[PDB]
Paper text:
[name]-M-15 (cefotaximase-Munich-15) is a class A extended-spectrum β-lactamase (ESBL) capable of hydrolyzing penicillins and cephalosporins, including third- and fourth-generation cephalosporins such as ceftazidime and cefepime, respectively. [name]-M-15, like other class A SBLs, employs an acylation-deacylation mechanism to hydrolyze β-lactam antibiotics, utilizing four invariant residues: Ser70, Lys73, Ser130, and Glu166. In this study, ultrahigh-resolution X-ray crystal structures and mass spectrometry revealed the mechanism of PAS inhibition of [name]-M-15, an extended-spectrum β-lactamase (ESBL) globally disseminated among Enterobacterales.
A cocrystal structure of enmetazobactam with [name]-M-15 with a Lys73Ala mutation indicates that epimerization can occur without cross-link formation and positions the Ser70 Cβ closer to Lys73, likely facilitating formation of the Ser70-Lys73 cross-link. Ser70 epimerization can occur without cross-link formation. To clarify whether Ser70 epimerization results from cross-link formation, we obtained X-ray diffraction data (0.95-Å resolution) from 3-day-old cocrystals of enmetazobactam with a [name]-M-15 Lys73Ala mutant ([name]-M-15K73A). These data reveal l-Ser70 to have undergone epimerization to d-Ser70. Comparison with the uncomplexed [name]-M-15K73A structure (which at a 0.95-Å resolution clearly contains l-Ser70) shows that this is due to enmetazobactam exposure rather than mutation of Lys73 to Ala. Epimerization leads to the d-Ser70 side chain oxygen interacting with Glu166 and Asn170, which causes loss of the catalytic water molecule. These data show that epimerization is not dependent on cross-link formation but, rather, is a result of breakdown of the PAS-derived acylenzyme that occurs prior to formation of the Ser70-Lys73 cross-link. Indeed, when the [name]-M-15K73A:enmetazobactam cocrystal structure, in which Ser70 has epimerized but the cross-link has not formed, is superimposed upon the structure of uncomplexed [name]-M-15, the d-Ser70 Cβ is 2.9 Å from the Lys73 Nζ.
Residue numbers in the entry: 28 to 286
Amino acid sequence: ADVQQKLAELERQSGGRLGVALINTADNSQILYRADERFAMCXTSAVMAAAAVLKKSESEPNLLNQRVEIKKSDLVNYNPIAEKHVNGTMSLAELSAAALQYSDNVAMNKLIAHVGGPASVTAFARQLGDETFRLDRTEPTLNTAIPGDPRDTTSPRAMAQTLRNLTLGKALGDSQRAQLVTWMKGNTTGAASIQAGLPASWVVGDKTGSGGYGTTNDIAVIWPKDRAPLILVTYFTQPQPKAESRRDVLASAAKIVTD
Ligand SMILES: [Cl-]
């Protein structure tokens, strides 16, 4: 009850709409706030795209070593890694790492295209038992995050359950699961988000997202010191189209649900 009041207070102070799902694997419990409402995933959908490539690689050895041409025509709105490789190739492993660790738009688009497009990423989610996730569009339009628009959305509950499956469960083979976890632990974009609300000693793998309407998201697997791991989804969106980022709200939510 106290946790619920604190999240409601945070939401009100923020002015926006907050969605939280924590799974605590110590006792199989959950903390949920708007956890069945839909939220625009923005960049956090990259976890599902990378996982789809990893699953495909279980039947195709050396898939991760396959080379992909990078061209000027591939550049999108934010391409911090791919812009260094224009006119050469990157491997699918390198693209996975760039998408997950640097929020690289081109890299996400190459993962999406490789597996067959947004409907194929969505069909993979369905195969895993996630009947809520939908990836409708490619980068950059998947981040528009217009209120009331169901495109490119999921719920906090569904994404927490799916992230648990991907990182701690058996969706992927052992090599592929370990690779996903290693990639997420190496993320560079999340230090102001969930990580900022947790003790410094805890280990985090996370993927952020951002978009229109000040949408600010993070999904994480967390290893607290000497505790069973947690899964935490924090999604946040705001009423104004040009609202500024609010990573501090995600940090605050993480602190509230883990204190
Ligand atoms: Cl600390």
